[PDB]
């Protein structure tokens with residue numbers, strides 16, 4: 001059913017998790033379930049790996065994903081998420097630039113994602129699929 005789906009394994013995406021900035025990810029298979037997409041059964045989720053020195057993984061709703069082209073998208077993603085926010089505290093935090101450990105890790109993720117973007121889907125799957 002790959003053709004009916006917005007993303008496939010190896011596609012680079014930005015993911016939005018509450019309390020975190022938009023983060024560079026790669027759509028991948030769940031190491032235990034062996035699936036990359038599912039219905040939580042009307043809304044679609046995708047399994048993603050978060051790039052960086054301390055990688056993580058999650059099932060994310062399609063509405064919290066944006067196709068990754070590059071770092072230049074980040075500014076508009078922050079602005080759009082801020083305008084879409086209900087609470088004033090949420091808006092303020094979204095536009096506040098990342099700092100410390102998290103900023104360094106986000107930058108490491110970008111570096112990894114940009115290398116992955118320059119490769120074919122097959123090549124990046126082989127190189128950037130973090131085992132679990």
Ligand SMILES: N#Cc1ccc(C(=O)N(Cc2cccs2)C2CC2)cc1
Nearest residue numbers: 017020023050052053054056058105
């Ligand atoms: N290198 C690195 C790094 C990777 C991941 C995260 C991270 O905690 N989350 C939240 C999570 C949701 C589910 C599992 S983890 C991601 C950024 C949103 C932080 C740093």
